[PDB]
């Protein structure tokens with residue numbers, strides 16, 4: 001009902017500001033004062049590669065229903081999101097902007113924006129949470145393509161076209177922009193790396209992977225090409241509406257936050273679709289350290305519930321490596337999964353083993369016969385080879401959870417092995433250094449056992465325990481197996 | 496004449512037997528203590544202990560070269576390649592005494608079955624000495640070995656089988672480790688390939704995750720290595736001769752392994768590590784012999800001679816890493832350059848892209864490259880992405896989080912993220928941001944003779960004063976010591 005530039009920022013974000021001498025980081029866990037300071041149509045730097053910036057972008061594309069979901073968002077941030085969509089998108093490609101107010105304390109936060117050009121507002125009468133709220137918006141979407149966005153984003157130049165171009169060509173692609181960084185303190189728009197893919201460790205937390213050398217090198221002469229990501233971050237993405245609904249939408253019994261990104265990423269890949277990051281599509285996002293909103297069941301409890309619900313449906317037996325990494329999770333009940341499990345069989349979906357081998361080989365999987373795996377931790381320090389080969393001393397170095405020269409397995413043969421070099425007891429005398437040797441299934445000197453409730457690591461057939469007191473003066477040793485803190489070793493993944 | 500078991504170990508080792516490390520830079524006492532036919536553990540994979548090895552293979556002339564070797568070690572080598580190789584596959588053992596102080600060291604072994612001794616009139620060095628032995632070889636196939644090695648069970652067959660199938664293969668065993676102090680025979684990793692950094696010193700690369708996955712099926716298969724260590728290898732004799740043998744004007748040590756490795760690959764052959772061939776070797780810390788030329792100088796001479804012939808333009812990245820090498824003269828190379836054209840031979844860019852892709856290579860419009868060193872510490876990203884603080888962390892010389900370039904666009908870049916001066920006030924933290932060729936805040940210059948790193952259009956220099964507290968800062972810029980930065984490669 002109003003052209004967006006004629007909308008009044010100052011009247012909106014007006015009372016709802018930050019009174020004198022209050023906490024600026026109060027309601028949203030980002031600096032609201034700095035957010036409020038900025039204009040709705042603020043200038044941001046074009047963070048795209050030269051290759052993108054300078055390409056007649058296709059505009060004969062199917063239009064999209066943009067779904068933004070929010071609970072207690074900062075008016076400034078919400079507005080800036082909405083306007084950035086309208087300002088930077090070709091107008092014919094925006095069918096509508098659906099705002100799903102997920103039970104925000106003041107309905108006026110969302111309601112007032114309903115004045116704006118193509119903005120509809122849908123209020124949740126109770127608290128539904130991120131996933132359910134997104135599904136509502138998608139069901140209310142008129143367009144043939146869905147675009148999701150977090151409520152504190154800022155679309156960049158020609159952001160939408162490259163996303164649509166992908167989905168229009170192939171409906172099975174679920175496509176995400178590069179997530180530029182909006183600083184939570186100063187609110188500066190910072191350009192992010194285009195050399196990353198999304199991923200995870202066995203704890204099933206999202207993390208950004210560096211692109212492998214083999215991959216980068218294959219993309220050297222096509223730097224702005226699509227990136228095939230094993231996981232989407234989950235905040236900003238575009239998906240064909242019919243594909244979204246056919247492929248099961250979201251797990252409706254997930255709550256608040258967390259899990260859904262994992263779940264959908266697995267699902268899409270496993271059931272014949274693909275996931276991509278598009279470097280020419282840039283969308284800023286306010287990344288933050290704490291959650292500002294309430295979690296009904298406890299923060300970490302609900303996260304585990306959702307994560308479980310995903311793992312239990314899609315991961316097959318490899319779900320155990322998650323439970324191995326996060327034993328605590330086994331206690332959290334996750335309810336019924338029959339619908340989502342049948343969905344899987346209904347869709348004739350591939351197994352997780354497929355996903356691991358073809359989509360995310362990079363992810364280190366322990367052998368079915370391994371006893372433990374990962375890093376061997378002692379406080380902050382972790383068991384490091386220090387680049388040593390055969391006949392080498394082994395050491396400790398601060399942990400960097402990247403499994404480089406700090407990755408170890410504890411085998412069925414009872415050996416502590418890195419690659420095919422295994423910890424070997426050269427000399428049984430107390431104080432003697434241990435050496436890295438080639439793995440023999442029978443050497444006897446490289447057989448180890450975990451004792452004192454998986455806290456220690458004892459040399460088998462002996463009274464001797466691995467000991468780090470000698471690191472700074474030679475390397476790790478065997479010493480007489482007693483109550484030292486230097487003899488304490490815990491594996492990252494325990495089976 | 497005399498069979499090896501009837502040879503008198505005691506009495507040979509006898510006139511030799513007081514610092515153990517002063518003689519050979521390994522524990523001579525422990526070496527001397529051991530039997531010539533010492534027991535060593537079978538360090539091969541199980542999937543090799545059950546292999547009917549084809550034994551209708553060509554024989555080899557084994558070339559062992561030495562200058563002041565330990566008698567115990569030399570003998571043990573010779574006997575190991577007699578005991579552990581099938582007799583019909585050993586045509587002869589050629590011992591090239593490279594002007595050793597007592598000629599009796601080599602001469603006395605002439606008594607042993609299949610052993611021939613050649614004394615070098617003058618000091619030649621390892622490459623020239625090897626060429627002599629190869630020219631004196633009968634046999635269709637050459638095997639080279641260092642004079643302090645110990646062949647393992649069925650070591651030779653897998654090497655020959657490869658060369659017999661395809662004469663262009665140059666094959667090396669996996670090099671088990673003989674302890675310099677203990678003299679214990681220790682089994683080595685089968686998950687390594689040979690390689691190098693831009694300083695052109697040999698190093699072992701841990702073979703990639705991508706590779707390790709592909710070799711699940713047949714784990715003891717040949718390894719295509721971009722470099723051979725250069726000590727133990729087997730090569731068809733005619734192929735050795737045809738492909739130019741060794742760069743004859745190389746001296747005592749070093750270079751030859753690089754030179755031949757490049758040559759073989761570049762001129763249409765292949766280099767392999769064969770995991771079921773196990774040969775032990777006494778690895779050492781410093782060289783026990785003397786260098787005519789002053790050690791570091793001769794290494795540089797040889798290395799240059801190789802680089803200047805085979806590396807094309809990329810020789811500069813070597814000179815960037817080792818600036819001192821641009822002087823100390825490499826002499827005439829016209830023959831070896833002619834050799835290259837004579838063979839046709841592919842360019843180094845080919846080698847880098849097809850044989851050793853994993854080698855991190857700077858863009859030729861970079862200004863500096865490598866890590867950014869301050870003391871033991873290097874410039875580390877600390878896993879931080881865009882909008883992150885950058886820091887210092889002790890240098891692990893292994894890449895990744897500590898890889899940096901200084902571009903023609905004047906920017907200090909890691910991956911596609913560049914160092915950014917967000918705030919010009921002294922003491923301000925610098926943040927890592929996406930690289931834009933037009934942001935003046937992402938621009939540096941190197942000043943005060945490549946020692947400092949100054950933010951361009953400013954009075955401000957990269958500084959580690961704050962590094963420990965939060966992150967690295969941009970600082971007031973003057974006589975600090977925290978502002979000192981050496982890039983490993985400059986150009």
Ligand SMILES: C#CCCCC(=O)N[C@H]1[C@@H](OP(=O)(O)OP(=O)(O)OC[C@H]2O[C@@H](n3ccc(=O)[nH]c3=O)[C@H](O)[C@@H]2O)O[C@H](CO)[C@H](O)[C@@H]1O
Pocket residue numbers: 069070071072073102128129130133149150151152153177178179180233234235236255256257258259260261283284285286287288293
């Ligand atoms: C570009 C760009 C954006 C990329 C950022 C990104 O991937 N964010 C994901 C990341 O989000 P996050 O920033 O930590 O969480 P955030 O507080 O932004 O919550 C997601 C959105 O849903 C809203 N929300 C949240 C919780 C809730 O109960 N109800 C809501 O309506 C909230 O207002 C916000 O707009 O992980 C989530 C896990 O479920 C989702 O997958 C998010 O999409």
Ligand SMILES: C#CCCCC(=O)N[C@H]1[C@@H](OP(=O)(O)OP(=O)(O)OC[C@H]2O[C@@H](n3ccc(=O)[nH]c3=O)[C@H](O)[C@@H]2O)O[C@H](CO)[C@H](O)[C@@H]1O
Pocket residue numbers: 559560561562564593619620621624640641642643644668669670671723724725726727746747748749750751752774775776777778779782783784
């Ligand atoms: C199996 C197995 C072991 C393989 C180990 C290996 O590759 N060793 C190499 C490694 O050797 P190193 O142990 O550092 O050197 P080392 O002192 O053993 O010299 C190599 C050989 O040359 C001999 N030599 C040396 C100096 C000399 O003037 N004359 C010689 O004949 C020496 O006695 C020995 O037989 O690098 C060398 C660089 O030129 C060669 O490439 C060696 O072959």
Ligand SMILES: [Mn+2]
Pocket residue numbers: 150151152235285286
């Ligand atoms: Mn968010």
Ligand SMILES: [Mn+2]
Pocket residue numbers: 641643726776777
């Ligand atoms: Mn040697």
